[PDB]
Amino acid sequence: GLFDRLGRVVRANLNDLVSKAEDPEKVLEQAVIDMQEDLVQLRQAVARTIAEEKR
Amino acid sequence: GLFDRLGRVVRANLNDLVSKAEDPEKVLEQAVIDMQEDLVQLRQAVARTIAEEKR
Amino acid sequence: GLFDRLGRVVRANLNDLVSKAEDPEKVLEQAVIDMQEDLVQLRQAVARTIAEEKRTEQRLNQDTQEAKKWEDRAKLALTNGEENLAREALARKKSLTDTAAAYQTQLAQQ
Amino acid sequence: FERMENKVLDMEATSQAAGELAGFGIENQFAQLEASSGVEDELAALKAS
Amino acid sequence: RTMSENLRRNLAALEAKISEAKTKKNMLQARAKAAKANAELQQTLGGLGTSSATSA
Amino acid sequence: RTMSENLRRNLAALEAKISEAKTKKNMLQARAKAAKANAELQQTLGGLGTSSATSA
To answer: With DSSP H G I counted as helix, E B as strand and the rest as coil, what are the percentages for chain A, rounded to 5?
Structure first.
């Protein structure tokens, strides 16, 4: 029923209130710090790859 | 009886109230995010298909 | 008694009130959405119908190449001078060829 | 049992046709053709420079 | 050799009737499911009556 | 030598049917999983109907 498609637009009202907060960087930081923990293992994986290459 | 066909038109009154809200994008987002979760498996399925092709 | 035929016309009074509402589309939508759920199964049924048609079609393809295999083992027998084995292969293929014709009629109706 | 699973092979064969009951067929993919032939035409016209 | 060949008639009959019954199983099952869909096509010609029930 | 060579026909048949059944296992399994994805492609042509259900 139409009420479900209305559910997307009333959650978009909430999305307007949180967009109006305008402090975007905070999630940019979240994204890049999560990848840093992966990146240390990722470089390790590259290193393991090189290590088989070296051995 | 006619009351059942009236039931469609009184639910259409509700459909007018929710249409008058005019924030359509919210369901557009719902549609495309649902397909993204499928799409990662869908590309995986293509990959599996290629993988049999490769093996 | 007349009161029962009056019952139709007093329900027609109600039918006038609901007709005066004039928002017909709502039931048009009801009709077409109900048929969509059936239609996905209906196309599936067509597909099942085609699927028997296909399973039979590949079978008939497999049969008609197998009929050649028996003729090929018979050509080997004929060129060798082994007519006994050629006639064994001749029995095999005829049996297959008539079953192939049966599947061709099964597909024709399908 | 394996033969029943072949009937699941016939079900997927049905399912690839099934888009046609939903009004999808070659007429859709025909656009990507007319397009991709146009892509080769413009890439040829580019490399002709 | 004489009675043995009649056993070959008998065995040839067993395989013939059994194999034909197997192709009947396919044809009848397929035809049955197909017929349920064809019956739903007749019912879909009747679907025009189900819409008529509120088209008034 | 005569019957022994018929055992070689028999053994040649065993390995042929078994090895072919192994390549059927690969082809059928692959085709089955592939078909689940192709069925999801038909369903994705149906995904256009799922968006239509609120596009109205």
So the answer is: 85, 0, 15
Q: Nearest chain C Cα to B5, which residue?
A: C27
Does residue A13 sit at the B interface (CB-CB below 8 Å)? yes
Return the closest-CA partner of residue A14 out of F32, C105, F51, B23. B23
DSSP characters for E2-56?
Answer: HHHHHHHHHHHHHHHHHHHHHHHHHHHHHHHHHHHHHHHHHHHHTHHHHHHHHH-
* Nearest by Cα to C58 from D13, D2, F27: D13
F38, B49 Cβ separation under 8 angstroms: no
Query: Closest Cα partner for C18 from B15, B1, B13?
Result: B1
Q: How far apart are alpha carbons C110 and C7 in whole angstroms?
A: 52
- Dihedral angle over CA of C18, C20, C24, C27, nearest 10: 0
Distance, CA of A5 to CA of A14 (rounded, Å): 15
- Chain B from 16 to 55: CB within 8 A of any C CB: none
Q: Technique behind this structure?
A: cryo-EM
Nominal resolution in Å? 5.1
